[PDB]
Amino acid sequence: GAEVEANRLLLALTEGEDFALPDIDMSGPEWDIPGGDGSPIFAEVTRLTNEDLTTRVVGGSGTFDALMASAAAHLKQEFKEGRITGGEYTKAYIAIVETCMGNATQYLLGRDQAYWAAAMAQIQAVSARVALATSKAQYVLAKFQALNAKSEYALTKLKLSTESE
Amino acid sequence: GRDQAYWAAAMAQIQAVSARVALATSKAQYVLAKFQALNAKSEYALTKLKLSTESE
């Protein structure tokens, strides 16, 4: 029976130096990509065409339209409550097209990229929790690798006498 | 910049599904690292048991 002797020897040649390994149960639904198989990562990114800047219609489904129809919806809050005549409101609305068009392009080219950088980082943040358990498991491996060099120090020192004979 | 901003949001979705695959592997190399720690304790004992052999 070699099984019994092997276990007995291990618990006797290494006494006191029984360092405990991590025991985190990485088998739940929180150790996968957050949200599971329904996370917003599995969407369908459509090809960015020129119908996403402006749909060529006022109050459209683009970014230029949205910004240009939200500034007008933020100035009409004054015009419909006094504080400005009709002429002043329109002049303000017209002088915004340069700003909205400039800021719509900045948002469009960068809206998608700023999401994946906040989506591929969540995954690279859950796997960091996994990569933290390993760092708590290589810590004992490094500790054993230090006591595995002290033994080799003794073994080499015991080989000097053998070569002397 | 229209086309380039789409592929950066398309080649990242693929690099986000394969991250789910790469997360299962990180849950499978975790036990591999755990076993590699108990595989160094055994070698510690084996080397310590080799000191006596060289003594004889």
Place this chain on the structure above:
Amino acid sequence: GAEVEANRLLLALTEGEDFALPDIDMSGPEWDIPGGDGSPIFAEVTRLTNEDL
């Protein structure tokens, strides 16, 4: 009995040079991602659309 001889030899071939290893107990709840399984990392980042500007 090879066990006794191995231990005796090690504590005799290396005398004085017994350098101590670290002994930090990395088994609490502070050695994981801060906040545990409820950290703000497990949110749901939604696709940035033009309704966020």
Place this chain on the structure above:
Amino acid sequence: GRDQAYWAAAMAQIQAVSARVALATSKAQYVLAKFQALNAKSEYALTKLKLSTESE
């Protein structure tokens, strides 16, 4: 830049807790380097004792 400035402050906290773990290892490889210096002095003696063997 709102989202990106959060993950850079969230994936750095994780890379700051694991630095505490990576600091314990640096306190455990320090003795490993110390033993690796006394493991080269022994090899110095062993090689010096092998000169006499080749002389005979």
